[PDB]
A paper describes a structure:
The MIHS-HaPhy complex is the first structure of a 6-phytase showing a phytate analogue with the 6-position in the catalytic site. Co-crystals with the wild-type HaPhy grew in clusters of insufficient quality for data collection, but a successful hit was obtained for the 5% active T308A mutant of the enzyme. While the mutant MIHS-HaPhy complex crystallised in a different space group to the apo-enzyme and tar-HaPhy complex, the overall fold is essentially unchanged, with one molecule in the asymmetric unit and residues 184–189 disordered. MIHS is coordinated by Arg18, His19, Arg22, Thr25, Lys26, His128, Thr219, His306, Asp307 and a number of water molecules. The Nε2 atom of the catalytic nucleophile, His19, lies 3.2 Å from S6 of the MIHS and is in-line with the S-O bond from the inositol ring. The OD1 atom of Asp307, the proton donor, forms an H-bond with the oxygen at position 6 of the inositol ring, Fig. 5b,c,d. Thr308 has been mutated to alanine in the MIHS-HaPhy complex, so a potential H-bond to the 1-sulphate is missing: Thr305, the equivalent residue in EcPhy, coordinates the axial 2-phosphate. There is a second MIHS bound between three symmetry-related phytase molecules in the crystal, in a completely different conformation, with the 2-sulphate in the equatorial orientation and all five others axial. A key feature is the presence of a potassium ion, coordinated by four oxygens from three sulphates of the MIHS (1, 3 and 5) with its ligand shell completed by the main chain oxygens of Gly230 and Gly231.
Phytases (myo-inositol hexakisphosphate phosphohydrolases) catalyse the hydrolysis of phytate into inorganic phosphate (Pi) and lower phosphorylated myo-inositols. Here we report the identification of two HAPPs from the enterobacteria Hafnia alvei (HaPhy) and Yersinia kristensenii (YkPhy), together with biochemical studies of their pH and temperature optima, as well as their phytate degradation pattern, which show that they are 6-phytases. The enzymes share a common catalytic site architecture located at the interface of the two domains involving the conserved N-terminal active site motif RHGXRXP and the C-terminal HD. The two-step reaction involves a nucleophilic attack on the phosphorous by the histidine from the RHGXRXP motif to form a covalent phosphohistidine intermediate while the aspartic acid of the HD motif serves as a proton donor to the oxygen atom of the scissile phosphomonoester bond.
Author numbering: 4 to 76, 79 to 183, 188 to 201, 205 to 413
The structure:
């Protein structure tokens, strides 16, 4: 931080930790002759190991926030607040974060009281806050791709060939029941206007690549049937996943519909004069706000703010436990600024369960907000400017009533 700057508040939008596959469909089973390995928990649940890996991040956050003078060297209950999505995986990630940040302090997490409905903070379109127009979705995704979607597979030939090899797709029951080239067999298509999906090879491979990454992060004895040997290969496979998220979650039209409530909540917590839905029982003296969500949430916020990144040592742009960390800093004369970093465990740190300390830290990338005309060279954006960007980026129809 520049000369005289002081950290005042932190807002962490974190993905949940290492989880089992959220689904295992007949198609997923049929695209390989290999057997998918069994997980120790129900579909979509965070594992005990994933909780531990989140706690290690909590421990890192504690050391960092102590160092920067924000936290004491148990915090007061007012100083730390957790809002988790209703899923087991997010709830337990919020708990695991507190177990690392403030061990055995019994700090509360919060979440929506009806866990049988979507939380509109995280899924406003699904919750029925607002809707999208089918023709505008189609147009926006095509523009984001810069190529017709029908030929998207051509752009990812190398990656799709590598997926095919890892799966042994030509030998699979799918190829037995239907040339059997992964890319040609499953052309990319957009399925749409409150439900939007990328169908075909890239969509499917995106899911599978993420599952392989989760297997590795879980320290499973056999990952992708032993077929992923190098970091290059991990990058090539996760490229498919990152691409699907660029199109389905970063595309500004979609990003603004699904991301508006979160961005308002984040902005308000940083000190913007943006309406946001108050979080129940939060203190005006709050110092750390931890929001436990999903990769789509991070990607939405990325899209809205025009923020892009690559993470050294981490093939997934939105890995389990990876978090956008927004910070309000003030200069010596009390002017507020916002910084944003994408803070994460490398693939190796996930696999090894590495302790994360000041000496051996989490990965961290400082993000540029391109529209922040008066940002400093080290990426500090005046709050006044940040607030204007937020005002321009939100979809008013999607603000939380
Ligand atoms: K294991």
């Amino acid at each position: 931080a520049p000369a005289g700057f002081q950290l005042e508040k932190v807002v962490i939008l974190s993905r949940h930790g290492v989880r089992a596959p959220t689904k295992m469909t007949q198609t997923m089973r049929d695209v390989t002759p290999h057997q998918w390995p069994e997980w120790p928990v129900k579909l979509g649940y965070i594992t005990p190991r994933g909780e531990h890996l989140i706690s290690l991040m909590g421990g890192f956050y504690r050391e960092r926030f102590q160092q920067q003078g924000l936290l004491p060297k148990c915090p007061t209950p007012d100083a730390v607040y957790v809002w988790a999505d209703v899923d087991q995986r997010t709830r337990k990630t919020g708990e695991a974060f507190l177990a690392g940040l403030a061990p055995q302090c019994d700090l509360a997490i919060h979440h929506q009281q009806n866990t049988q409905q979507a939380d509109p903070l995280f899924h406003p379109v699904k919750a029925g806050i607002c809707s999208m127009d089918k023709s505008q979705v189609h147009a926006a995704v095509e523009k984001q791709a810069g190529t017709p979607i029908e030929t998207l597979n051509q752009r990812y030939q190398a990656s799709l060939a590598l997926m095919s090899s890892v799966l042994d797709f030509p030998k699979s029951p799918y190829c037995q029941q239907h040339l059997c080239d992964f890319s040609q067999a499953m052309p990319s298509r957009l399925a749409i206007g409150n439900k939007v999906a990328l169908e075909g090879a890239v969509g499917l491979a995106s899911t599978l690549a993420e599952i392989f990454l989760l297997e590795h992060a879980q320290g499973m004895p056999k990952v992708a049937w032993g077929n992923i040997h190098t970091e290059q290969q991990w990058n090539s496979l996760l490229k498919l996943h990152n691409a699907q998220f660029d199109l389905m979650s970063r595309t500004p039209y979609i990003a603004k519909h699904n991301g508006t409530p979160l961005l308002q909540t984040i902005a308000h917590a940083l000190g913007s004069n943006i309406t946001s839905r108050p979080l129940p029982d939060i203190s005006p003296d709050n110092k750390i706000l931890f929001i436990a969500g999903h990769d789509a949430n991070i990607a939405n916020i990325s899209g809205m703010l025009g923020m892009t990144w690559t993470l050294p040592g981490q093939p997934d742009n939105t890995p389990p436990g990876g978090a956008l960390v927004f910070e309000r800093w003030v200069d010596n004369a009390g002017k507020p600024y916002v910084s944003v970093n994408m803070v994460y465990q490398t693939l190796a740190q996930l696999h090894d369960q590495a302790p994360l300390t000041l000496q051996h830290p989490a990965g961290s990338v400082r993000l540029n907000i391109p529209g922040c005309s008066d940002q400093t060279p080290d990426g500090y954006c005046p709050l006044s400017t940040f607030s204007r960007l937020v005002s321009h980026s939100v979809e008013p129809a999607c603000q939380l009533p």
